[model samples]
Target: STGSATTTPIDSLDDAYITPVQIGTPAQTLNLDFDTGSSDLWVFSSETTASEVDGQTIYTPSKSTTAKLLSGATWSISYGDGSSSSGDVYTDTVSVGGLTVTGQAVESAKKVSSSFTEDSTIDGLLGLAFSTLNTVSPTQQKTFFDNAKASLDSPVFTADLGYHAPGTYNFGFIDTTAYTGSITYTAVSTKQGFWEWTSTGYAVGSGTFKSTSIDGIADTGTTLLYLPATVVSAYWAQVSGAKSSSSVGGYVFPCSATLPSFTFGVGSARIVIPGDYIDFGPISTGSSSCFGGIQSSAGIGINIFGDVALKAAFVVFNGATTPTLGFASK
Candidate 1:
């Protein structure tokens, strides 16, 4: 049998999805976000001040017979959304789906920023980003995926995230029934510790695809799609009531406006985000106003194809020699 497993994706807060994972002995399960944007298998733990952490399941190494302390080990992480967390480290058995990783470093959070604490369902993060971005100090830690890769039939994982629907994270194999049409492959550049790729061009509404290349990352953790300021401005310009708003967070628009999907180039394929995806759920009072999922990536410096865009297509993260990625309509 292939040393692989299919992770159940539970629809979570907003557009996020969580995967159930077992950590330590006796199999204490927790819902984790398998983030490709950052590295570190950190969890809520007893070490965290009760008041500092909200309603989240915590990992108790003391109850596990196989838990081991990596004395003085620590880790800290910051995310694109400005969320942060830091904690001590322990060695334990971590299992996801049917794959088990022994001696995996699990960071137990001692301090979590308010942004993370407010997210009650997310117990921790299971980073699928490259090991180079792991946050363990003194000695870097290997990700659960890296530890399980050699035993897997193929060094690959496919993310099948759905819009407000249950999705699946299949390891070492691609599920043919999950997607339709041909899978277009794109070369990936991991020099920046991301599944970074260059999109040939993009277009708003039914406009022509501008040939301006955009360097972007495929981030499963992020909830919305983001492009440069100029690009985001152009797309929102088409919306009748779209406006940059501090209170609504990002571009706000009239919920009734007929928004056109934004299209981006990838290899020989053109991924078009649907109209509904552009109108991120209402962030303001009343259903008449809504937040725009497409945002300005100016401050972040890199475009992000977040869950909003990923949900519109099927994605394959191939960690082989060429490190190529495949995308297709679902």
Candidate 2:
């Protein structure tokens, strides 16, 4: 099956993207955060606490004749953004775009962090990472894409993240019109439960391109580009007034300061993130200080090419054998 779906931005927040997914019989639909960093299809459900319900929609398994309890199984997850949730498991029919995924494990939440519970944007998370990282107990769970790949025209998906606008997540097929130039394909290492890869090199602006390896993940759930402290500090050197601010949580520069372009290597394919994309906008309204999106991933050992970096290119997450990442200019 060939299918694709459109994703919308969270209200007033371009940090994350939201997409509609149908779960259970009769197709109870919910807006979910399509997280490429995680591997569980979890949602706010009948099991969530009353106060935690807030205004978000809840998934009711009992209302769906197709829903079946995965007895005694449970799942819990914590995100790099400090968001987390825990829940029981159920088997149900879930559909997205034009594909129908049967017997997919739908994790329903009973516990959630304030970051998740207080968020009014999405009702759940739809993990797009490898099923090897699934949170289900006893037997591992497969993602909707995993189960649907057998019927797909191709075992791949594309992530076309936009700049303060809507994006598209196409499944089972790659849209040639979505990218420009030749795609640079990179080998992926899934050892750490992520689509981790090593760039052939990097550089700041017109500075000489450095040939070195930078290991990182292609994470959609995250909002900024995180790099090693050394690399992050070097990028700020070109900015007139940029510094690491503890109170600010990252390097900050004057909003009006001219920024430099940042480029990375995906094998031999070099994708340059323009200077404007590095500005990351203002830290807050009226605050002369703006946060640098290329912060050091100090807390988390892994580096992330989040939305800021992703918006610079059209990406292909190929789950086909050898699992690879293909990138091209948007």
Candidate 3:
């Protein structure tokens, strides 16, 4: 005789960090740092006895009204930077932006490295870059996209970084109202998990005559926009009298100067990066200078369009019906 199976219930959150829709409940909210560099959602838990976790926020399911622990689903993830963490899976009633999805896969970390556990401000990370890096097997599990696709007005999600200025990130259903009219989009390529595209050339300060060919990958995991040394040097050259500074780990320039406007020609679409993005943070390496937006990452193959570029434009990761990326004005 066949036996009956029982399935546990879970919850989903609409606004998870900067990306919309995270599988989990509000009572035990998982405010993960949504990273496109990897496909996994993990959070620290009170059960962790490791000394690495000092000021990090650990999710306590016991405190939540609705929290179900997964019997034998434990996961460990290690990054290239040598950071590692281990946790068990749990089901919970999650809420975000008035959306609800049950049976969502969520990780609860019991062990973590000092680097991650010490960063008290950042709770966890949510990877929305691509499905290839997804830790949850699609065959046995459904991603937040797979479950929430039906509820979204458009099978599209837009990221708004400039909404609350430099650091305040926002995400939600793409508002067509913010668009000026028509926006150009690039076709998706299956070669790499990241959204890759070719750039005809890059322009800085409205004065460019050199033709340079480059490729750009939209990655959420990477914090800074990485560019080729040649392009990086050229970009800094145009910004008044910018120079390379080892102290700051990149080119240090005067933030008050009339910065050059940089733009990337992504095939038919053109993305302009604002000057403020170049200023970044106050120079920590030097006396009291600020860093430029464009930096050198010669060893790191391929240019990465990080949050600096993302903040300037509205990006949509279309993984539902089509495997394409859409860009529009914010």
Candidate 4:
């Protein structure tokens, strides 16, 4: 079987993306962050402290007849962004688009960080990374994609994230009409429990293409694209007043700066990110200085091709006997 769902930016800034998910028998729909960086499906629930609930939707296990407690099972997860949640586990019917996974482990949050409570648009998270990274103790749980892979017509999913608009996630099949050109395929290494791959090189806006091997992970959960300091510095050098600022916490420049487009090689194909997308928006409300969508990955250790890059093309995550990633211009 195949399925497709729409994902939209949480705000005009495109700070994060979210998709609707159906949990429990009666189908409680909640907006969930479809994170490809982690492996655990957790939600805000009745068990969560009222102080942590805020304005987000909460999943109620008692309201669904199919909801069953996963006795003795518990989970706790901390993200790269420092946001965290810990909770007990329950198995319930979970559906994405039209694909259904019965008895899917659903972690009910008992605690959440201030960042989560403050962001009311995201009600929970649905992890799409390798199940080996699952945080559930006693017994680790498989992700929705992992459990549904065998049943799918094809063990694949595609992400088509848009800039300040709604995108689509397609399961079991690829939409040829979604992209403009042929896809360039690259081998993926899942040893680190991520969609890790190496790029041929990069070019700074119409500049020379450097043939270098750059290792990075394709992460839908992350908002910014983080590359090596050398690469990031090279890109910023072309701008008039761009600078790496400690006070701003990242690369920032005057909002009036004429940004350059970024191009990265996926196999032999080059995907270009528009200059407009690089202007991530003002650092503060009504501020004239804007933060950069591309930043240095020195602090992160490994480079990350986050939403900023992903939104520029159509990406396929093929979970066949041997996993691979395919990128195409959109």
C-alpha RMSD by candidate, in order? 1.9, 1.4, 7.5, 0.7
Q: After superposition, how far is residue 43 of candidate 4 from its true place, in Å?
A: 0.6
Predicted model with the maximum TM-score:
4
Runs off by more than 4 Å, candidate 3? 1-26, 64-66, 79-83, 136-142, 163-173, 209-213, 254-257
User: lDDT by residue for model 3 over 28-57, one digit each (tens)?
Assistant: 544456565665666777777668677666
- How do the predictions measure up, each by TM-score? 0.94, 0.96, 0.79, 0.99
**Candidate structures ordered by lDDT, highest first:** 4, 2, 1, 3
Tens digits of per-residue lDDT for model 4, 96-180: 8898888899999999999999999999999998899999999999999998898899999999999989999988999999999
**Model 1 C-alpha lDDT versus the unseen true structure:** 0.84
**In every candidate, how many clashes are there?**
0, 1, 15, 0
Candidate 1 has its poorest 10 consecutive residues by lDDT at 1-10
Top-lDDT structure, candidate number: 4
Total colliding residue pairs, candidate 2 = 1
Q: Write the per-residue lDDT of candidate 2 for residues 1-330, one digit (tens) a residue.
A: 877788888854476788999999899989998888999999999999877888888999999999999999989888877778998999999988878889999999999889877787889999988888998887788888788888889999889987778889898888888888888888899898789988888889999988999999999888889999989988998999899999988899998898899998888778889887776667888899988888999888899999888889999999987899999997
Of candidate 4, the 10-residue stretch with the lowest lDDT total is: 275-284
Which candidate, 1 or 3, would have the higher TM-score against the true structure?
A: 1
Q: Model 3 — TM-score against the truth? A: 0.79
- Scored by lDDT, model 3 comes in at 0.60
